[PDB]
Ligand SMILES: *[C@@H]1O[C@H](CO)[C@@H](O[C@@H]2O[C@H](CO)[C@@H](O[C@@H]3O[C@H](CO[C@H]4O[C@H](CO[C@H]5O[C@H](CO)[C@@H](O)[C@H](O)[C@@H]5O)[C@@H](O)[C@H](O[C@H]5O[C@H](CO)[C@@H](O)[C@H](O)[C@@H]5O)[C@@H]4O)[C@@H](O)[C@H](O[C@H]4O[C@H](CO)[C@@H](O)[C@H](O)[C@@H]4O)[C@@H]3O)[C@H](O)[C@H]2NC(C)=O)[C@H](O)[C@H]1NC(C)=O
Ligand SMILES: *[C@@H]1O[C@H](CO)[C@@H](O[C@@H]2O[C@H](CO)[C@@H](O[C@@H]3O[C@H](CO[C@H]4O[C@H](CO)[C@@H](O)[C@H](O)[C@@H]4O)[C@@H](O)[C@H](O[C@H]4O[C@H](CO)[C@@H](O)[C@H](O)[C@@H]4O)[C@@H]3O)[C@H](O)[C@H]2NC(C)=O)[C@H](O)[C@H]1NC(C)=O
Ligand code: HEM
């Protein structure tokens with residue numbers, strides 16, 4: 084009949100490095116029904132049992148897992164998790180798929196809401212990923228070896244055979260160029276414009292072993308292990324400090340870029356969007372997403388309305404800190 088959703092966990096008591104690839108969290112292969120998706124972080128956490136191994140979890144479980152497994156910073160975890168949950172999760176059962184649709188999220192919500200998981204393209208997941216192809220080409224969730232080959236190439240060319248901040252700057256730009264030239268539906272605005280810069284530094288800040296204090300750089304063996312196999316490196320120790328998107332500013336600065344997309348269903352036709360969120364206009368992302376939620380839930384009434392109000396508030400608590408102050412919106416009023 085429904086669940087009453089708890090407020091998000093706070094930061095972990097212990098915030099130092101530790102062994103995360105340990106006896107209680109062994110890698111195991113997929114069973115029938117297990118779900119995986121476009122996030123190598125959540126994928127690895129599920130395949131090591133930090134999340135439920137079936138790849139369906141509550142917001143709270145996702146937050147505690149990203150913190151325990153990788154030392155993802157609390158506010159960043161809140162901002163990402165409730166974004167994903169509002170758009171792609173089931174607010175009544177409080178379950179989110181980290182991939183595509185599954186009966187495991189429970190009785191479906193009223194359309195146009197879907198609870199179709201992080202695979203759903205267009206508002207959250209989008210284009211110019213590092214190891215995933217654009218949705219226009221048919222698969223936005225599976226690892227793509229050709230794209231990983233380019234990851235390797237750019238690491239060879241700019242990072243001495245390792246992935247570092249310099250490589251991220253170059254790879255991010257080049258992937259944008261690839262999508263401009265080949266994808267007539269290419270979008271790079273709003274949520275995607277913000278997430279696309281952070282995602283390129285997560286491998287440096289979170290996938291590099293926490294015992295490495297200087298000259299942080301990711302080997303291709305470790306990259307492959309996480310991005311392709313959903314497996315922590317042997318003896319992997321998480322970041323020694325809570326972390327997220329440190330260095331994303333520098334990635335943008337290496338090749339300044341403006342939100343927009345290919346217009347009129349044609350390649351090599353990128354038009355700027357001046358209304359999109361960007362890095363000096365972050366609250367636009369908040370307002371946009373709240374708009375998107377209204378489109379999904381145009382007139383909720385019961386347990387659903389209640390859980391929407393709570394999840395929206397939860398998200399705001401993170402957004403407010405992360406974005407440096409945003410006026411909370413109340414599209415369904417108060418409880
Ligand atoms: C991601 O990973 C990559 C890959 O590892 C990593 O890249 C390193 O980046 C750092 C800097 O960002 C590099 O180190 C710097 O290299 C600068 C460029 O060096 C060239 O030019 C030097 C300057 O030459 C002067 O004199 C000659 C006359 O001899 C003249 O022609 C020139 O015009 C100029 O006036 C030159 O010395 C250097 O050649 C030396 O070194 C090579 C070895 O690379 C050797 O083979 C040569 O024989 C020679 O000894 C080269 O051609 C350099 O200018 C810069 O120096 C500054 O800093 C040092 C100390 O930090 C000071 O001593 C000095 O005052 C300078 O101000 C510095 O050394 C490094 O080489 C990169 N490594 C690689 C492999 O590319 C990224 O940093 C990583 N990213 C992140 C974010 O971590
Ligand atoms: C793994 O991921 C890769 C990368 O995303 C996928 O490969 C891409 O597949 C698409 C679809 O076939 C390719 O798109 C086509 O590209 C043509 C241009 O490509 C050349 O130029 C680029 C560099 O600019 C080179 O990298 C590339 O090797 C080529 O030499 C376009 O001309 C095509 O356009 C036509 O169709 C569109 C859509 O209908 C129209 O809008 C156009 O007007 C035109 O008629 C087209 O966009 C793309 O090039 C591929 N990239 C690479 C590097 O391979 C894999 O399919 C994916 N596969 C899996 C599952 O592993
Ligand atoms: C906390 C909740 C999280 C959510 C909801 C989430 C969601 C997502 C989604 C939807 C994508 C795909 C983006 C796209 O294609 O546009 C993605 C990509 C990514 N995520 Fe996560 N993520 C989370 C946490 C993490 C953590 C903790 C890490 C690292 C440890 C991480 C690393 C990545 C990376 C590297 C990518 C890019 C993959 C690629 O482009 O090849 N994420 N995430």
Ligand SMILES: CCCCCCCCCCCC
Pocket residue numbers: 159162163277278281282328405
């Ligand atoms: C892969 C997870 C994406 C991170 C969360 C989306 C919003 C970005 C917040 C950081 C602002 C600089």
Ligand SMILES: [Mg+2]
Pocket residue numbers: 121208209210211212215216217223
């Ligand atoms: Mg993508």
